[PDB]
Amino acid sequence: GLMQFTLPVRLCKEIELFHFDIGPFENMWPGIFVYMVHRSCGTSCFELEKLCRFIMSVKKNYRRVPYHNWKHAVTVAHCMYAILQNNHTLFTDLERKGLLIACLCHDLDHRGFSNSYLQKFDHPLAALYSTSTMEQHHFSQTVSILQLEGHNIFSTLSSSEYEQVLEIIRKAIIATDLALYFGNRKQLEEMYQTGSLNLNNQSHRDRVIGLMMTACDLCSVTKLWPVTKLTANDIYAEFWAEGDEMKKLGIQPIPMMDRDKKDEVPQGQLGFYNAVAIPCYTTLTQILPPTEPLLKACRDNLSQWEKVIRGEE
């Protein structure tokens, strides 16, 4: 109870900033996550023995893939921490509880293949979940781990509070399906411009949390350029492996996943920043102004990708 998690000074200070990188020391990430729960939610909102066991079961159920791994989990959770600490009073206790866990669990048991590749492979999961295939699976994995003996970190919540947090986590994880992101941000864009946006309206809260989830999920594009650039290699390592697997199924993959179209990557990044990331953090900044540093960082990294194309690196 009187046991506070602490971090060395440089991390103590930098972890508060949107552009924080959690570092190459795997064994520190659990500690970094508990630190963030303790500062964001309180030291009393999870029994440490149950939280510690839950975290390590979540870690065990992430695969050793190049991008969709335990490091991605904790990175996405840190960006959510930075949003929550910069927008203190907007979020309920159950939202702070739910969303950090949502983020940590949001890619549980990812194989490093898209929903598209599962459907074309005809993977069993694609018969069980026709749309948002991996995302329904990640929610299903989250519930399984919550039901392991001694893992139920929500045990001391009322029956209704418990149902509310799992509903928050499910909507949060479903929203990381980027197919759902485009429609969600359009709706939020209209709602904000027309003045109809209302955070007392639950359906509107749900939309805002969906956007926050997209923003945290995409957060490699909001880092120092060397983090962004080197994370991009991991991202493309999964994409090219999927492109390889599409070729094995007899299907020419989209250029994004073709290791033969490596030359097209800089331009594909410009597309991605202009079509997905910049609009995401723009709308998020309008709805939550203290998240402006994510938009600024994203624009700086676009400008770095423009320099790669111009041959200035």
Closest-by-Cβ residue to ligand IIX is 268
Closer to Zn ion by CB, 84 or 215: give it: 215
Q: How far is the CB of 246 from ligand IIX (least distance, A)?
A: 14
Which partner from the list Mg ion, Zn ion, ligand IIX, none does 163 bind, CB cut-off 5 to 8 Å by kind? none
Q: Which residue has the tokens 């709805």?
A: 287
User: Binder to Mg ion among 176, 184, 291, 301 (CB under 5 A)?
Assistant: 176
Identify the CA nearest to 258 among candidates 270, 243, 248: 243
Please say if 204 is a catalytic residue: no
Smallest distance, ligand IIX to C-beta of residue 283, A: 17
Which one, 67 or 154, has the nearer CB to Zn ion? 67
Question: Footprint of ligand IIX on this chain (CB under 6 A)?
Answer: 178, 218, 220-221, 232, 235, 255-256, 264-265, 268, 271-272
Q: Which is nearer to Zn ion, 157 or 234 (CB)?
A: 234
Contact 33, 104 (CB under 8 A): yes
Position 107 contacts Mg ion (CB under 5 A): yes
Q: Is the Cβ of residue 68 or residue 170 nearer to ligand IIX in the bound state?
A: 68
Give Cβ neighbours of residue 196 (< 8 Å, ≥ 6 apart): 190
In sequence order, what E strands does 51-177 have? Answer: none
Q: What DSSP assignment string belongs to 18-57?
A: TT----S-GGGHHHHHHHHHHHHT-TTSS-HHHHHHHHHH
Read off the tokens for 280.
């995401």
Answer yes or no: is 107 a known binding residue: yes
* Residue 238 structure tokens: 């999964």
- To which H or E segment does residue 270 belong? helix 265-272
Q: Which of 19, 38, 68, 151 is catalytic?
A: 68
CB closer to Zn ion out of 217 and 234:
217
**CA distances (Å), 167 to each of 162, 163, 177, 257, 288, in order?**
9, 6, 16, 34, 23
Q: How many residues bind Mg ion (CB under 5 A)?
A: 2
The CA angle 117-123-124, to the nearest 5 degrees, is 150
106 sits in which H/E element: none
Tell me if 122 is assigned to a ligand binding site: no
Q: Which does 221 bind (CB under 5 to 8 A by kind): Mg ion, Zn ion, ligand IIX, none?
A: ligand IIX
Report in angstroms how near the CB of residue 53 gets to ligand IIX at its nearest: 29
Q: How far apart are CA 77 and CA 36, in angstroms?
A: 9
Residues making up the binding site = 68, 72, 106-107, 217, 269
Residues making up the binding site for a divalent metal cation = 72, 106-107, 217
List residues binding Mg ion (CB under 5 A). 107, 176
User: Catalytic amino acids?
Assistant: 68
Residues making up the binding site for 3',5'-cyclic AMP = 68, 269
